[model samples]
Target: KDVWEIPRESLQLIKRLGNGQFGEVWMGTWNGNTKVAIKTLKPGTMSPESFLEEAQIMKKLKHDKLVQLYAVVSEEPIYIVTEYMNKGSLLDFLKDGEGRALKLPNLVDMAAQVAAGMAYIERMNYIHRDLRSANILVGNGLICKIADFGLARLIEDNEYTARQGAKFPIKWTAPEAALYGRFTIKSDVWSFGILLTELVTKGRVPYPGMNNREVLEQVERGYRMPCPQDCPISLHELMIHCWKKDPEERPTFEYLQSFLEDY
Candidate 1:
């Protein structure tokens, strides 16, 4: 079957949720009752063909740890409907009062969920070029779902090369991705390492006060961020493993899930 196409008028925009590089997200109601998150693309930000291509793949991806794509309005001022994550972005959730006091076990479970989700994507042979805390959503029970596929790329022969000078999130990026624009599942693993740090620190910035250039330099020099206070030593070791300079040395999402299962 083809992608679900919902009527533009069927969704009632409630409030602005957040802004992304190509669109603004809104809390909306679909078909008058179902709570949904609507992402409306900005004018001239993306070609319709490119947008729909991504949507087609997204519509087929189904997993508890991955956000669900409900439908799309493929006309002028396009909208992509997805499951509403009540707790919102993981980054903001971690910064909230309640999230700050979450027990270590709860945080570890959330991380495990994310790894499981990414493992599903990895099995599908996709690379989330922008994996980060902000791109992960939190629903009820701290169920973490990987969201925002704007930077996702289907791996062709296990790798993807971005156009020259394309921008990316520096601190959350793997060394090969940040420096050479080479992305793979292992690159996402690197970002997952940074996400692990965010979970442990309750939303502390990845590189603290370092600028993009400084982070690049430090990483090239084999420096990594220190473990957050109270973070388990084992998890810290996993984070270090994820950040190895050689992508081939990084662990797979499947391995991460197995390790997190024992956490």
Candidate 2:
């Protein structure tokens, strides 16, 4: 269906935003009018088939808290057009002075917003596969929209497993997923804990001074990063719950959403 297709000629890419494992992203205008973020496809990056499936899922999962996919220019030199967040990714935002200036209340509110997005994704039965502050976009009014579901997938029995070869980030990834490729909504919750650390610590990478193998080995042996000096005790406890050894012991996004709202 061309329902979400936009003619390439109708778009005017304004500036290079940044490149990912796939290719460069751009700041652009839809029809030279509305602001949009454009993710351009690079050949031989990830298989086009995989990227296409990512587009397919983005089209289905819709929520104000999730990045909205506006259109796709699917011909050669493909582009995935989405809603723009002028402040860019939350990670970048937190690295700036403005991000550091945000109080605890502001950080809590952002977490609530992300939880809301994850709640909706859970109900829709999709595993985000990758969840991090870098994947969340911050817009005007500090609205945070969950982005980068390129690794997302529809789960069977509340779970999905990847074939060998997809490199998981040891730090943010849950133990099961990082080691066994077994992904679940609980694993997404696991990464949310890392994202919370990113928010409260103002973009400091979790488990600083540690290598991937080191982090993974320590995490497997029951080691978790200690709470930061600035983090609230309550939030830190919640993050700890998200990192429980058994995925079944982890809280759901719906629960986290309501908890943050109350916090």
Candidate 3:
């Protein structure tokens, strides 16, 4: 039950934009009217049902801060068409020669936007499973939006369990998710802390030399990312609170949204 059938007379494939566990994304024009990003899954990367499931999830989602899908074209070798983000991902912007911490106000605004978008997905009983600067795209006028929902999972009957390919960036994952592959709205809030750190540090990579196993060991041993010199005390405290070993200790996204909105 996919949304689109592949058309034969499509325009030329422009260039590769990104490559992920799922597939390669390309820039392409549709009917010479507008530019779009086309994600073509690697051969045998995803089953038809899995592709349809992801598409359905994207199809049902609607938010100003979430990437919008133009169509899903194919079943055998699934490909998705989405609105092209001209400015590219937030990570790309941060990694550019800027080399500076984002202003507190701007960071707060971006955090609020992510919270609002995540809240929408949470209401649908789904978890994004991956939330980081690289996954957040910045488009026209510095509008921050969340994209790449390939790891998204629906909370089945109010109880969610991870299957294969549940891995996320070690730096941006919650304790529970990194340890037991368990995810919830609360764990998502924890991930938000890492994202906030990234905003303050201008795309600095966390745990530079640590692999997933080493990172998990450090997290289990109560190690945390040290606050950058310029990060506000209040912001550092919030990050620590969100990274609690116990998921129940973390603040809700709604509370985080309010806090950022006020800050």
Candidate 4:
């Protein structure tokens, strides 16, 4: 039994951040003292159990690089309050046309930050089912914070079920998740491969101009989207290793951290 009550009128909605199959998220402020991001689910759409699943995941996750969940409020609709990231998401930052293109070293640093966050979760035997640039938030110019764990799930005896429903994000998902309906740390490595591509390109859609089937086919055949023209070859090689045809050959997050640090 919990005793927390949500303040209905305390938060002032600022503007929308992003939208997807789940719902819309907004940049908002709590009271006049604290800034926070608010994620509200569409009314009459989610069961209590489904909503709690997301809340529980957020509650379970605790890492410096991951977004901090503040509170869960339900009033006519459900709302999740998290620490307000002032600089906004990676998607928002990349869209800015300043001479802010990411340098290879900085990009590697950001990837290491992400891997560090994921490594924390992995140590707890959990998996970040969805890991993408858009889901990452940049606080300071070089500080990367992983956000949005709506699709996260616990790994039981190191196994995950295949996502069969039509609601999966097929494009960002790995081949095993689509074909075999299974997810593992190795599958996460595959998504990281695509994420590395996104980071180097500054949020450009990976495998643009290709259908889901084509992208999956290419991935199944051991083809990865090339790193953009200016991207460092060493980084591209890392991405390739991440998307290796044999999951066993892929580098562990710890190994990735060490590689990026020395490179």
TM-score of 1: 0.97
The lDDT ranking, best first, is 2, 1, 3, 4
By the TM-score metric, which is better: model 3 or model 4? 4
Instruction: Give the TM-score (vs. native) of candidate 2.
Output: 0.97
Q: Show where candidate 4 strays beyond 4 Å.
A: 1-5
What tens digits encode model 4's per-residue C-alpha lDDT throughout 1-263?
Answer: 34334586888888897785656888888877887888788777776557657777888788898898887785647788888777777766666653156566777788888888877877877777788887889886567888877777788877588446644566677777778778877777778888878777877788988988798788788777776779888888988888777678888877776777676
Off by over 4 Å in 2: none
Per-model C-alpha RMSD: 1.3, 1.1, 2.3, 2.1
Model 1, 18-113: lDDT tens digits are 997778999989889899999888878988767666677787688889999999998878888999999998999999787878988888889999
lDDT of each: 0.89, 0.90, 0.79, 0.77
- Mark the 10 consecutive residues where model 2 has the least summed lDDT: 44-53
How many clashes show up per model?
0, 0, 0, 1
Q: TM-scores of the models, in the given order?
A: 0.97, 0.97, 0.90, 0.91
Candidate number that wins on lDDT, 2 or 4: 2
Which pairs of residues clash in candidate 1, taking residues 3 or more apart in a chain or in different chains?
A: none
